[PDB]
Design a protein around this nucleic acid. Structure first.
Ligand SMILES: [K+]
Ligand SMILES: [K+]
Ligand SMILES: [K+]
Ligand SMILES: [K+]
Ligand SMILES: [Mg+2]
Ligand SMILES: [Mg+2]
Ligand SMILES: [Mg+2]
Ligand SMILES: [Mg+2]
Ligand SMILES: [Mg+2]
Ligand SMILES: [Mg+2]
Ligand SMILES: [Mg+2]
Ligand SMILES: [Mg+2]
Ligand SMILES: [Mg+2]
Ligand SMILES: [Mg+2]
Ligand SMILES: [Mg+2]
Ligand SMILES: [Mg+2]
Ligand SMILES: [Mg+2]
Ligand SMILES: [Mg+2]
Ligand SMILES: [Mg+2]
Ligand SMILES: [Mg+2]
Ligand SMILES: [Mg+2]
Ligand SMILES: [Mg+2]
Ligand SMILES: [Mg+2]
Ligand SMILES: [Mg+2]
Ligand SMILES: [Mg+2]
Ligand SMILES: [Mg+2]
Ligand SMILES: [Mg+2]
Ligand SMILES: [Mg+2]
Lengths: 101, 79, 49, 88, 132, 197, 510, 311, 171
RNA sequence: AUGAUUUU
RNA sequence: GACCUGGCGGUGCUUCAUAUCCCUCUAGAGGAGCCUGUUCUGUAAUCGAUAAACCCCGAUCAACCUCACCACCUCUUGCUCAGCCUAUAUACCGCCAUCUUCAGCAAACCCUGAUGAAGGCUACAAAGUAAGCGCAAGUACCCACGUAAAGACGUUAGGUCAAGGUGUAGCCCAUGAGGUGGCAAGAAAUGGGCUACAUUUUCUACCCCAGAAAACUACGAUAGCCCUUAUGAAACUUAAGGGUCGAAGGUGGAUUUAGC
């Protein structure tokens, strides 16, 4: 019942990124230091590459939670610019007004 | 702002001083240096509980146990 | 949770406690299209096939 | 309640931002929004814990909607028993 | 020319209220906000959550009370309490009003895990500020 | 039969001498049928007047202080006076307060709106103590200053410690006290490597 | 803050259209609101998955979906105990039968718990017989269940079996009194025998035991008056403080539908002196009925001072919560207000009217009639139009009994012109009410007395043309105008020098 | 259109609400003024709308409601005023009276501004035109110029309003005495994002300490020292006073200008009135409103525009 | 998504497309215009597909002096209710499709000779029930404007009469 | 110097 | 044939434009290198804007994702009481552009033109009265100035079915969904911007009293090559730093932009 399949895929990526998150943190800790032996670091590199693709946190995009717009989205309200302006003009957003100075 | 939230009644020493969980880990070597960094990071972390902080240490111990053969190749002994 | 925010309102509408103008508009348009003749082809019914 | 209170007005903060006025191909024209946050600081001194608790509960329950409150404490304490004298 | 939340002129028989007759540039000058909360404050958080809750509440109330609401809704939050104030008509029977009010308050309280209280002010008809 | 007729507002039944705090016990939305005040709000039209209180959404959009009338405030404070203690008379001035309580603790509580009240900013604990109050000789004073570094301000002669690592405020307070204790003990303690100064 | 008089009950809305007008509307609005809450709860229980999202810190257990299902489907003692806790009588007994057929052992505590569930909500008899060991707890709960199910003779037989082998004794006392219809002395002898059994078993009677005895003695209207005092002395000797239910049972027993009620007056006086300046706590389920019964005695005795003592006792501390349900509070308020109107100064009565009505309750039509009678006795008729307006507000517009009383009172005697005009306006308003009766769907009532009073008031106020219209209503509704009304018509005609009007009066008189 | 009966009902409601409001605030109903009502309304119903007329207002119905004239025709329909069928009876009757007084006078023979048009409409209730206002003013001026009697002078003064003529004299800071007894004056000056507070003593060695530093070291630029020399050199008092000034914010030039304004205002407490006026006429006592203009969206700068392409 | 929904007015305004540059200079035909249909007319609050009966909203709150419980109509009963609603909708549609005969004037599509009924009463309690008004000519005159271009106006000639010798005409 | 045809 | 209204006139007169039409004032673009759009060419490889009113524009932004494109493969009541970024912006709602750096648009009446389209003013006044929108007035920032904001009715079937929704038309084993991999470049031209061609300059201390460099080791790439670092699972590609080299450029053709 999401807005579109693109939003549905993004939700799945977020869910699969929330999972395996600690495992990525633990493996990447091995990879991001020079104290550990290089052979162990390379094995950690192989393990983190073998991890599922969707678990990568950089595949998550902050889309609008109302129109699934991939860009023009304010992160504080998680709304696209058009939806944000529509609510602000109607007055349904507290403490938000036209800026004149 | 904290009512109804108790981290199992843990104290500051339990949250911070995690060196007691590194008894299995060797006290000398690069593995010790890496675990000192991990424990220092866990101690400074305010968003994690004692249970999960120990779980990270447990995972590193299990991973090093599995990869002991590589450590033997690199002239490192674990446990 | 769009699944919750949609199924809950769908249940309320079927229970007669929520009136959706948009859903009424879609149902009325679909009924008129069926009366006109344009009905949704069933799965496996290939007009081009 | 007999509490010594001093009230002053911290400087206001205005957070402004800009967005596209149109839906397409109209980057030049913008609509600017702002959020104004007005601050009021009331400092009450020389009160006990019981008096402070009652005063806080009374004001917080009577606090109107759309108003945020941050209360900073200054608790007086003595030296701990271990730090009384240099045993080491 | 701008057409953002503006009721344009007409033959002159169109009735409008105070809120819908005032353009968005009159916000905080001639009319206030329809929702009040601490989310949109310096240092505070959960602004997105409050916005989503407000949008759902307005749609839920609109569908739960068809042909009843006259003007927009006033949403207020004080700590954990949520206050929903609406201006409704008098066509429906008081039994239907009380039944819906009790049902709406209970359903929203369980859904949002906060005490929700609904207040209604009935008017004989929709108040007309002017005729555009 | 005709439609049900609304009764006249109870403001007519209300008298001039009335217990208004009883009429408005708690914070409530504005009700013209319950408020006997002919208050008008709204920008007037040309050759017009502000809209009447009946059906005025602008009045409803105002947080009303009807429940906080001066009479109500005095009565509420009188009842709550039984719940409050008295500040010690000997601590008349801040100098006396500093003399008897060298250690000061600062913590912040945050009041928000919404179902959740959790706030990570409520874990910060600040401990301030003047090193003059602490029993420190020359060696302990110098070693303590070097250990704390920028945590000590020489102009005010105040050592400030901020603790936020612990999830709970009580744990941060305990850690702050523990840090002050070990700093004091180690400063008094003398090490052999210090001879290479 | 203090109680406000102009305000309606807090449960209702504060909107003129939404505020209830009468007691029936008040009850209907509450039932509708409760119906909405039940519907919302039904939806939540039927679809828990739509509300399983915790967003409030700290957690609020009450605002969570409700689950009442036997999750553990395995046939075992633990799951059987789970169904017992869930109070699934049909599932528990079927599972117990399946467990017994399987042959696995069942604990005595679990069997006793199952019996308690079955007794409160046959199968219970079959399980009780199937018990390898029946303990005193099983016998006690089975007797209590039989008494609750009105199987008093069976409960007595089971107690005899227990003898062969506190709440039980209370069930026995109820069983002995109710099972048979013997004389009062025989029932008292049975109670004494049960008490002797209680002493032999070293069991102390409690407050519930005393209340059950008094209510059983209440079944005999007059034969058990003195034994009620004997039971009360027993309660004081043991040390059990009488509860509101205990006093309710005493007053309902000692006071009976008789004329003198001298002892009933003495009993209520002693009880009020005993309970003067004492706060109360919930002790017995019949504590609510104490205040309504006491108010009924006060109304019967016509002792307003006693009623004020009862009202003062009710308002002392938290005793106001014992006023009882809606029917109890309506009876209490109605009798209290009626006695106030009967035996108090009119000024103080109006003050009580303002304080109670409508904040305390919505008045009944008979109560409004009594208020009019009090005003008639006080000879303060300027408030009669105000009472008519109050009756219209409170839903007494078309009762037609208040309308007749108001019209008769206003037209009984002549008044100064200012009061006469006000009475004429009230008569016109009542006339409009008669023209807009909801009863007109079946039939419209135009009483001859009502028509005469309205016409008399109009003539005394100078509404000659309206009087002729009233005369037209007289001949339309086959009602005969009175001689005094005709004389007033003749006087108006003579003043206006209208022989045509005089002939009209003569024609209608003939 | 509001009738007189409706106005009376509003007046009665206003009185009842005023007594209720006084009861709510716990003050004397008799000694309750409109200012007290305004304070109670502001506290009970706090409104932050910038336009005051959009805030809740509880005033007398006479002031709140507009002004309407009475019906000229009664039950019989006969108008009450002879000049009714002109549509502007109030104006034309007034013109008739002025012309009559002008004839009578012919037979006999700074802060006062003429009434504005809007207030003339209020006095005459009925609407007037711009040239109607011009004709009425012309008659009043002609009436005033002619020999006026007692009634004519009163009539002319009826249509005049007082104007407060604000003086341009610069205020003088009070002279204070320090611990040593030296006389000094303290003033402040403000340039663009620059604030300076200057303490100038009556007698001294001609020093100017800027933030505890001498002027030639604090401002190496010669132009800044020229600015500091401007006040004292103008009044021919160069080197005869000592200044201790603290300045914060802005650039070097803004700080110099702020100090110059602060010293000039402080020096006015020691120079004569004519010198004070001469300094004001020279621009030494006027705050400069020139501040940085905001940048507008869609433009490179404040006034600078993006490059415009015809095709 | 639930949030990606509009109200009845927001949907019908777009669907009807009354505004737009098409209906400004005669750029579109009026034959394909569709009329707005109210979807909240025949619906009663408390009616659902499942056929649940809520006490106080769908069914009377109290029956036989007792508070009713939550009920659910049977499958056959619910089918009857659905069939009744469909039949009522079809009857309403049939009534709208019914055409009222109008008396034609000089021709079938000519406005001339068509009576306008009695003249509107005056504001001073004056009536003209005796007079009758009939149209003689309806012409669409045009003028040129700087902004809009062609400006369309309607010029109508009418005649009034009572049948007793008093009559007149106007434009 | 020029501005393809039909589009109220 | 004679007219009503509007437009237009290399149409007359008068007053005019105040960053504004000309003579004037300052700094730029167009020629150099680089960054970034667009047009044409090429591949298997999106779409839209594309006179004023497009061209660092939808994007306050593309290694995977975004992605809607292409190649291959997989699935059929499919996250959804389906779905479709599929054709129609010449069916629309919704946000807008421009005249507007305007001041007009007018309901409802009355009068004139013999009751035609149409028109409705002269103040020492000769048919106009006018609700309402806009202007104005208020409001925001540092004032009453200035700048913001606002700016009606309409013109350009102006832009947006790809923010979202929606009428009509089209598919339902595919014009729907998913996975892997891959292109997003330059023959050439052009818009905008950045850096320079230096002496009012370049380097250093300093933030305004100095010492050096200054024509083939002078100025000048943020260009090219190598290395390191930061984020990322993935950096020949993104960014930062260091090392190496020191190119065209020597004040710019026709033309053109902004500023009181
Ligand atoms: K053609
Ligand atoms: K150039
Ligand atoms: K479409
Ligand atoms: K360029
Ligand atoms: Mg990303
Ligand atoms: Mg614009
Ligand atoms: Mg510039
Ligand atoms: Mg035909
Ligand atoms: Mg040619
Ligand atoms: Mg052509
Ligand atoms: Mg160039
Ligand atoms: Mg392209
Ligand atoms: Mg294109
Ligand atoms: Mg891919
Ligand atoms: Mg890609
Ligand atoms: Mg596709
Ligand atoms: Mg096409
Ligand atoms: Mg278009
Ligand atoms: Mg201005
Ligand atoms: Mg602007
Ligand atoms: Mg303006
Ligand atoms: Mg087009
Ligand atoms: Mg296009
Ligand atoms: Mg496909
Ligand atoms: Mg350089
Ligand atoms: Mg380089
Ligand atoms: Mg890396
Ligand atoms: Mg070089």
């Amino acid at each position: 019942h999401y807005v579109d399949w693109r939003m549905w895929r993004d939700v799945k990526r977020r869910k699969m990124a929330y999972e395996y998150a600690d495992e990525r943190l633990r493996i990447n800790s091995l990879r991001k230091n020079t104290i550990l032996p290089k052979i162990l670091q390379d094995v950690a590199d192989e393990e983190i590459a073998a991890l599922p693709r969707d678990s990568c946190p950089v595949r998550i995009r902050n889309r609008c939670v109302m129109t699934s717009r991939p860009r023009g989205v304010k992160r504080r309200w998680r709304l696209s610019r058009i939806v944000f302006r529509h609510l602000a003009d109607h007055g349904q957003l507290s403490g938000i007004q036209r800026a004149t100075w | 702002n904290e009512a109804g939230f108790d981290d199992d009644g843990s104290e500051f020493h339990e949250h911070i001083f995690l060196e007691k969980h590194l008894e299995s880990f060797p006290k000398q070597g690069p593995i010790r240096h890496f675990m000192e960094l991990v424990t220092c990071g866990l101690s400074k972390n305010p968003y994690l509980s004692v249970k999960q902080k120990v779980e990270h240490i447990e995972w590193f111990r299990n991973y090093f146990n599995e990869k002991k053969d590589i450590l033997k190749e690199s002239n490192i002994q674990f446990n | 949770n769009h699944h919750t925010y949609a199924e809950l309102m769908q249940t309320l509408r079927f229970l007669g406690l929520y009136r959706d103008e948009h859903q009424d508009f879609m149902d009325e348009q679909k009924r008129l299209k069926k009366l006109r003749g344009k009905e949704k082809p069933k799965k496996g019914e290939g007009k081009r096939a | 309640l007999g509490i010594s209170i001093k009230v002053h007005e911290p400087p206001r903060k205005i957070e402004r931002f800009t967005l596209l006025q149109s839906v397409h191909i109209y980057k030049k024209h913008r609509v600017q929004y702002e959020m104004r946050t007005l601050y009021r600081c009331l400092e009450l001194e020389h009160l006990t814990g019981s008096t402070a608790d009652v005063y806080l509960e009374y004001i917080q329950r009577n606090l109107p909607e759309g108003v945020a409150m941050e209360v900073t404490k200054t608790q007086l304490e003595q030296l701990p028993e271990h730090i009384k004298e240099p045993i080491w | 020319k701008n057409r953002a939340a503006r009721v344009r002129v007409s033959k002159g028989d169109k009735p409008v209220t105070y809120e819908e007759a005032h353009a968005p540039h009159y916000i905080a000058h001639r009319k206030g906000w329809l929702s009040l909360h601490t989310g949109n404050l310096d240092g505070e958080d959960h602004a997105a959550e409050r916005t989503v809750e407000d949008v759902f509440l307005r749609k839920f109330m609109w569908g739960t009370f068809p042909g009843c609401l006259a003007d927009q809704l006033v949403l207020k939050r004080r700590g954990n309490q949520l206050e929903i104030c609406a201006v409704v008509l008098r066509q429906l029977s008081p039994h239907k009003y009380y039944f819906l009010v009790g049902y709406s308050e209970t359903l929203l309280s369980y859904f949002y895990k906060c005490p929700v209280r609904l207040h209604l002010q009935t008017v004989p008809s929709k108040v007309v500020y002017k005729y555009l | 039969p005709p439609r049900r007729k609304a009764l006249p507002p109870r403001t007519e039944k209300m008298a001039v001498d009335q217990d208004w705090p009883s009429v408005y016990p708690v914070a409530a939305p504005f009700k013209p049928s319950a408020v006997p005040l002919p208050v008008r709000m709204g920008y007037p039209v040309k050759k017009g007047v502000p809209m009447a209180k009946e059906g005025n959404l602008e009045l409803l959009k105002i947080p009303n202080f009807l429940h906080l009338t001066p009479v109500a405030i005095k009565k509420h404070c009188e009842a709550l006076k039984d719940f409050c203690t008295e500040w010690p008379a000997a601590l008349d001035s801040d100098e006396k307060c500093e003399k008897h309580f060298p250690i000061e603790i600062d913590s912040t509580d945050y009041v928000s709106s919404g179902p959740s009240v959790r706030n990570p900013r409520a874990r910060v604990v600040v401990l301030r103590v003047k090193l003059s109050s602490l029993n420190l000789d020359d060696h302990a004073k110098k070693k303590l200053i070097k250990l704390v570094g920028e945590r000590y301000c020489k102009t005010t002669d105040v050592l400030t410690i901020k603790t936020d690592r612990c999830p709970l405020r009580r744990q941060n307070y305990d850690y702050a006290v523990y840090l002050l204790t070990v700093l004091y003990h180690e400063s008094w303690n003398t090490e052999e490597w210090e001879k290479s100064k | 803050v203090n109680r406000d008089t102009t305000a309606v009950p807090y449960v209702f809305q504060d909107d003129p259209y939404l505020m209830p007008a009468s007691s029936l509307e008040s009850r209907s609005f509450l039932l509708a609101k409760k119906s909405g809450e039940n519907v919302a709860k039904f939806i939540i229980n039927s679809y828990p998955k739509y509300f399983q999202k915790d967003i409030a810190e700290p957690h609020i257990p009450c605002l969570m979906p409700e689950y009442f299902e036997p999750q553990i489907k395995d046939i075992s003692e633990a799951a059987l105990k789970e169904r017992i806790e869930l109070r699934k009588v049909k599932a528990s007994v079927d599972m117990f039968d399946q467990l017994l057929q399987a042959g696995t052992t069942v604990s005595l505590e679990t069997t006793n718990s199952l019996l308690d569930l079955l007794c409160y909500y046959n199968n219970a008899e079959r399980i009780f017989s199937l018990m390898p060991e029946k303990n005193e707890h099983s016998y006690c709960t089975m007797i209590r269940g039989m008494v609750k199910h009105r199987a008093y003779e069976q409960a007595l037989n089971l107690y005899t079996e227990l003898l062969n082998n506190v709440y039980t004794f209370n069930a026995l006392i109820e069983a002995t009194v109710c099972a048979i219809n013997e004389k009062f002395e025989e029932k008292w002898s049975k109670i004494l025998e049960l008490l002797r059994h209680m002493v032999a078993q070293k069991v102390k009677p409690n407050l519930q035991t005393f209340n059950t005895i008094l209510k059983c003695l209440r079944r005999f209207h007059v034969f058990a008056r003195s034994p009620a005092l004997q039971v009360l002395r027993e309660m004081k000797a043991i040390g059990i403080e009488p509860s509101l239910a205990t006093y309710h049972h005493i007053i309902r027993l000692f006071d009976q539908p008789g004329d003198p009620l001298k002892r009933s007056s003495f009993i209520i006086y002693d009880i009020m002196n005993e309970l003067m300046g004492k706060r109360f706590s919930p002790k017995d389920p019949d504590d609510d009925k104490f205040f309504q019964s006491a108010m009924s005695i006060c109304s019967s005795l016509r002792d307003l001072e006693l009623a004020y003592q009862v009202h003062g006792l009710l308002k002392t501390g938290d005793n106001w919560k014992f006023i009882g349900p809606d029917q109890h509070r309506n009876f209490y308020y109605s009798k209290f207000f009626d006695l106030i109107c009967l035996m108090e100064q009119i000024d103080v009565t109006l003050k009580w009217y303002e304080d109670l009505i409508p904040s305390a309750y919505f008045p009944h039509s008979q109560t409004m009639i009594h208020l009019l009678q009090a005003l008639d006795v006080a000879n303060r008729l300027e408030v009669i139009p105000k009472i008519w307006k109050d009756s219209k507000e409170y839903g007494h517009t078309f009762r037609s009994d208040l309308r007749e009383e108001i019209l008769m009172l206003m037209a009984r005697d002549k008044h100064p012109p200012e009061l006469q005009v006000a009475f004429a306006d009230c008569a016109a308003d009542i006339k409009s009410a008669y023209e807009s009766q909801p009863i007109r769907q079946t039939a419209q009532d135009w009483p001859a007395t009502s028509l005469n009073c309205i016409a008399i008031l109009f003539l005394r106020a100078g509404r000659t043309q309206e009087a002729w219209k009233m005369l037209g209503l007289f001949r339309k509704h086959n009602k005969i105008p009175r001689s005094e009304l005709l004389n007033e018509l003749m006087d108006s005609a003579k003043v206006s020098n209208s022989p045509s009007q005089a002939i009209e009066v003569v024609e209608l008189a003939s | 259109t509001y009738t007189e009966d409706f106005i009376k009902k509003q007046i009665e409601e206003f009185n009842i609400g005023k007594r209720h409001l006084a009861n709510m605030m716990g003050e004397d109903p008799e000694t309750f003024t409109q200012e007290d009502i305004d304070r109670a309304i502001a506290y009970l119903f706090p409104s932050g709308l910038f336009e005051k007329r959009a805030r809740p207002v509880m005033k007398h119905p006479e002031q709140i409601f507009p002004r309407q004239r009475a019906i000229q025709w009664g039950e019989d329909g006969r108008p009450f005023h002879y000049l009714f069928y002109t549509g502007k009876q109030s104006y034309y009757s007034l013109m008739h009276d002025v012309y009559g007084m002008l004839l009578n006078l012919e037979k006999h023979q700074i802060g006062s501004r003429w009434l504005i048009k809007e207030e003339l409409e209020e006095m005459l209730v009925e609407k007037l035109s711009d040239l109607d206002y011009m004709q009425f003013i012309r008659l009043l001026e002609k009436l005033l110029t002619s020999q006026c009697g007692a009634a004519e002078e009163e009539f002319v003064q009826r249509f005049r309003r007082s104007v407060t003529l604000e003086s341009k004299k610069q205020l003088i800071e009070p002279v204070q005495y320090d611990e040593q007894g030296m006389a000094f004056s303290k003033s402040e000056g403000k340039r663009k994002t620059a604030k300076a507070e200057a303490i100038v003593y009556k007698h001294g060695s001609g020093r100017i300490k800027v933030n505890g530093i001498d002027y030639q070291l604090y401002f190496p630029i010669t132009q800044d020292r020229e600015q500091l020399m401007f006040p004292f050199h103008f009044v021919d008092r160069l080197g005869k006073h000592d200044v201790t000034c603290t300045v914060s914010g802005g650039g070097r030039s803004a700080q110099a200008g702020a100090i110059r304004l602060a010293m000039a205002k402080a020096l006015c407490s020691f120079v004569t009135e004519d010198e004070v006026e001469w300094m004001r006429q020279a621009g030494l006592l006027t705050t400069d409103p020139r501040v940085r203009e905001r940048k507008k969206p869609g433009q490179e700068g404040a006034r600078r525009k993006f490059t415009w392409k015809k095709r | 998504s639930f949030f990606t929904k509009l109200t009845a007015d927001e949907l019908w305004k777009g669907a009807l497309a009354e505004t737009g540059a098409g209906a400004k200079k005669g750029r579109g035909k009026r034959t394909k215009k569709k009329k707005r249909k109210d979807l909240n007319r025949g619906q009663i609050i408390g009616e659902g597909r499942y056929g649940f009966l809520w006490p106080g909203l769908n069914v009377p709150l109290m029956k036989n002096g007792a508070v009713q419980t939550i009920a659910q109509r049977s499958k056959e009963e619910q089918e009857k209710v659905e069939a009744d609603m469909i039949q009522q909708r079809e009857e309403w549609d049939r009534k709208k499709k019914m055409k009222v005969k109008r008396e034609r004037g000089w021709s079938g599509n000519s406005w001339g000779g068509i009576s306008l009924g009695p003249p509107d009463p005056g504001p001073c309690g004056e009536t003209y029930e005796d007079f009758d008004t009939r149209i003689l000519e309806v012409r669409n005159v045009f003028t040129m404007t700087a902004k809009e271009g062609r400006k369309k106006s309607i010029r109508v000639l009418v005649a009034v009469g009572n049948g007793k010798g008093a009559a007149g005409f106007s434009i």
